[PDB]
Ligand binder design. Structure first.
Ligand code: SF4
Ligand code: SF4
Ligand code: FES
Ligand code: FES
Lengths: 633, 633
């Protein structure tokens, strides 16, 4: 089972699933082999009913699509649609939060409110919204209307691009025509230009894809901005992770998905109903997190993280998961079928994300508390149905220090230099105590033994004094393997990095260092890493493509992650990817994405399936940036 | 070659292509066989990097996607993305016209203007825009701003849905939650809900698809509305079609694509430059149409139609095509490679639609005349390069009477009843002179011998007194086979239909009948057929799903046509489709689309590959509607 997952709690549950005859994501993957080589290489097109078309990677016919689409056109069109689909997910998330904030300040949903006034005002200033002499709800109404306006064409480009990146970067992107005009406008234009008989030039197609990836960045940044206004900016928190955070004697309720507009309510209301749970024979309600909505409530409230991504079915296999509350994205629909065996109540809540066989509870922000109580009562009923029955919760969990929003990181640094908080960080980059910064982002992928790339690359970078930050299931992988526990700094971190984490941690009074890896939040909270890197770029007076900063989507899966990797390249980062996307069927497209895009944006994809080699390549990219600034390396 | 195309001019050019070694769309199709059965049936998913996933239609594993996506989920998700891509094409077209009208009335592009004042005012009234005491440019600015507002969420739903359909139909759709909130909003939400780990319920997925198809209908209707304001509402015109409209001694210039914002200018400017063409040794500039931009200028100006869809390469094979001026959609990218053999200058003009190897001329509405002159001068240069060389233009062409906008049809009927123009049509439906109405729409498809389904079904319906209207490449197929020539009414039309076409034609002074098939324009001009059917429904006091009206996408190919077929079903029409879309891998999805959707919208897909059987089924559907109204059949 260690060929399937490096997580020992997951391995234990894979044994339970095997002996109980419950098919898992790994079993379904095994049943899919060998996977289609045309699809693997990107040499397949189904964009019209003359298809399906395919192109042999090598050899004889077919060599070209029926309409004349070449391999490079077919590969670029498919990749563009993946980017647009990822942009659509992140921006749907952000749109839902924009409507929630508008409802809250128009008095239509009293469960929601402005919780971070300082964030609201700083966002309004960044956007150029007047704050002096304005009521908070009037400022917030204006911020929410600005968010919704970025989805369509208007007099300005997308402000959640142009106001969040350094001006030198905005000029570089503007020169290549890469600034999005509207978030949904770009998504629609990708679907148009990639339809049959439209754009048929690989360079033109990929430039459209870069622009659409910035529409995705805007959705990510908007989502983080609006969630912080509504629910609070994260600050350092202590909690736990892995399956051992489940409690056999509690009502165990997992929040799963990405949008916390509902799950934040679940956390608050669950506290209200401890007594109703206690009346049913439980110790209380144990809310636990799966995937990014789990990251959201972990970051803000210290909700323990149960599991992530590829291993999400294993939480159910314990027999102790009474409810799984879903909003949307990255939910394996298998959970609805597995629940018939494990007894878990799977609850969908979003009209556009239903699963056959799951109970649906319509959630409306206007009725959020009432909906949360109906849902938690279904969970309490389920707990009663298993009272006195044996469960198998692996007794495996890690300590997790998290909550490193960019505001939190700047605040922590300010204890070393109050008026220039970024300078202590840059000082240690320059003197070599910090070699560079690496962001781990993105998913797990059944093709990769779970967490193996994340932990292997992270171990090598940390020993080389790289400051490592993480989001999404990359943060999930690292937190489940102990990388967010400061007790592991001595074993994991090089001497220079250790000194810096210790100096910052002690100056914030902890008597101990920051954790080896800084958890920066959910997938949309990759925007937080952008805010930090952009602040560093501005403080240094350079563009992002001169900073010793790289990214690694080491085990990525989702169209959302393809979008994120692409805008990491677009804003100027060397970006490692650890699973082949469908590009190898076109050498010209591969060459653009791995080499010649350097000349457009300064970033580039680093394709490397072997994580030991990936770490070497990421260190090489970091060190080349160091040399370009004239630093020793 | 008659297995490839029933068009004799196309057959002649296929022989020329064969002996000159020029590979055609039919050759590329032959090189693709056998096509992938997973893709043909819809049982393939590439929506994340754990893929590609496939499901065996029958037999053993794989039976389910790696994430747990069932066959019905995978089939519904793929179909939804095709609808969204079609909506994105039609609405990108409409958006470009909305910006052009806004530029024109803001004094920023003097080549464009309000040419149809009556249409502008009627649209403004339909939308609730005040006209009394307003300047035309102020009304038009308001209409253009309303068009752009329908692309995003706002206080109202998409008005180019709710104001164009009968109120009973809007209520039925509203009851099922099918009214679009914004055009690009719906496209984005489809891409979101169909991404990995999101919507996983086939009925929920397909309901989203119906709503997105109405976003496509709105783009179609907006495109027709705005093009008529800018360029004039079509009225009956006489011209010719097929390859014999090319002139060996003229500069032959094809306008190809869908958006006529440029091609309408080409038509006007080409007249200006007859003398510059004559100085180069040509008789003049012979502008001819391919695909829907050809239909646009055929409908408004009588520009002869050269060819359509699947056979578009054959116009180049004559050796006489000096330029091919492209905007976007349905352009085989092969034309850029074929031009190296035929000498044609292929010119792209739209930033999001380039073809490697084609000359690009940036077109801006602000500089439209100057751009048109640069382009036509490249064409004149190309004519010079072939002076004195032999060409092979098939001496084959048909007479085409066209220009039947819905306003034109109502005007023609008004000569029989001035104050109640629809009543003469309904009178003849009731007495059986007109059995019903059939709209032929959509593409040709290399899988079907070109035009064979269109002409075979049309012949049988016309003999049974069905009033036949047509758009796009369906109009193209019928016009190239003589169905728009009134001299063929005696051979083609049943006695009752003949009497009606004769009575209307004579009352409009022609001394002769209307043509056997009424050409209603381009693919977006399917909205004209909706306007006509909705007027009939309102005059009769019933909903569209009670009218003896059907549609046939007999040889369809493009994602745009999938969208059109879906909204034909959504607004309540029995809708025949003559090529299998990728649905047969899911019986539940097939059953929803062919049977149970009747209970939602009253329309339904009729899948029939055999055109003789298709005609029987379409007559059966028409006659069932007749019986439901209590009419004899
Ligand atoms: S768009 Fe071209 S390559 Fe794609 S399925 Fe259609 S004919 Fe084949
Ligand atoms: S979304 Fe599911 S079915 Fe599709 S490729 Fe990914 S794992 Fe396979
Ligand atoms: S041929 Fe397998 S992905 Fe299309
Ligand atoms: S397996 Fe052929 S279309 Fe994917």
């Amino acid at each position: 089972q260690n060929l399937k997952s490096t997580d020992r709690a997951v391995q234990q549950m894979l044994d339970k699933a095997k002996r109980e005859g419950i098919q898992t994501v790994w079993d379904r993957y095994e049943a899919m082999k060998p996977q289609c080589g045309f699809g693997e290489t990107g040499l397949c097109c189904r964009h019209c009913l003359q298809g399906p078309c395919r192109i042999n990677p090598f050899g004889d016919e077919p060599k070209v699509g029926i309409c004349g689409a070449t391999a490079e056109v077919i590969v670029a069109r498919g990749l563009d649609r993946s980017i647009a689909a990822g942009a659509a997910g992140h921006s749907g998330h952000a749109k839902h939060l924009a409507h929630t904030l508008k409802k809250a300040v128009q008095g239509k949903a009293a469960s929601y409110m402005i919780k971070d006034r300082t964030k609201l005002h700083s966002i309004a200033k960044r956007l150029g919204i007047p704050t002096e002499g304005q009521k908070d709800e009037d400022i917030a109404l204006e911020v929410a209307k600005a968010a919704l306006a970025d989805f369509h064409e208007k007099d300005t480009p997308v402000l959640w691009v142009t106001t969040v990146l350094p001006p030198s970067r905005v000029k570089v992107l503007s020169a290549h025509g890469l600034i999005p005009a509207g978030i949904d406008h770009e998504i629609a234009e990708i679907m148009h230009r990639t339809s049959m008989g439209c754009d048929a030039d690989a360079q033109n197609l990929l430039l459209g894809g870069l622009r659409c990836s910035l529409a995705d960045l805007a959705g990510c940044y908007m989502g983080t901005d609006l969630a912080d206004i509504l629910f609070g900016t994260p600050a350092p928190v202590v909690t736990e992770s892995n399956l051992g955070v489940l409690k056999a004697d509690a009502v165990n309720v997992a929040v799963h998905g990405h949008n916390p507009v509902l799950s934040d309510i679940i956390v608050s209301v669950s506290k209200e109903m401890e007594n109703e749970a206690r009346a049913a024979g439980a110790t209380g309600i144990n809310v636990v997190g799966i995937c990014c909505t789990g990251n959201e409530v972990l970051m803000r409230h210290g909700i323990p993280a149960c599991t992530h991504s590829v291993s999400q079915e294993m939480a159910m296999i314990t027999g102790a998961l009474d409810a799984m509350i879903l909003d949307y994205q990255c939910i394996q629909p298998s959970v609805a079928t597995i629940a018939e065996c494990t007894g878990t109540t799977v609850i969908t809540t979003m009209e556009m994300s239903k699963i056959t066989g799951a109970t649906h509870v319509n959630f409306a922000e206007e009725a959020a508390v009432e909906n949360a109580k109906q849902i938690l009562r279904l969970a309490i009923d389920t707990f009663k149905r298993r009272k006195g029955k044996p469960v198998e919760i692996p007794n495996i969990k890690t300590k997790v220090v998290a909550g490193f929003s960019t505001e939190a990181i700047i605040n922590a640094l300010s204890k070393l230099n109050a008026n220039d908080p970024l300078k202590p960080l840059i000082d240690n980059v320059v003197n070599g105590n910090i070699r560079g910064v690496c962001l781990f982002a993105g998913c797990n992928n059944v093709k990769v033994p779970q967490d193996q790339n994340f932990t292997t690359i992270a171990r090598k970078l940390l020993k080389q004094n790289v400051l490592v930050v993480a989001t999404g299931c990359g943060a999930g992988a690292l937190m489940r393997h102990g990388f967010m526990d400061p007790a592991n700094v001595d074993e994991l971190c090089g001497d220079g990095l250790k000194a810096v984490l210790t100096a910052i941690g002690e100056a914030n009074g902890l008597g101990g260092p920051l954790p080896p890896v800084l958890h920066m939040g959910s997938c949309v909270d990759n925007s937080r890493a952008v805010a930090l890197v952009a602040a560093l770029a501005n403080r240094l007076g350079v563009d992002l493509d001169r900073l010793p900063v790289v990214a690694s989507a080491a085990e990525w899966m989702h169209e959302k992650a393809v979008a994120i990797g692409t805008w990491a390249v677009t804003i100027g980062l060397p970006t490692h990817i650890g699973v082949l996307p469908p590009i190898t069927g076109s050498l010209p497209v591969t060459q653009i994405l791995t080499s010649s895009v350097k000349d457009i944006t300064g970033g580039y994809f680093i394709v490397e399936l072997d994580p030991e080699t990936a770490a070497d390549k990421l260190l090489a990219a970091i060190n080349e940036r160091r040399a370009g600034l004239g630093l020793p390396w």
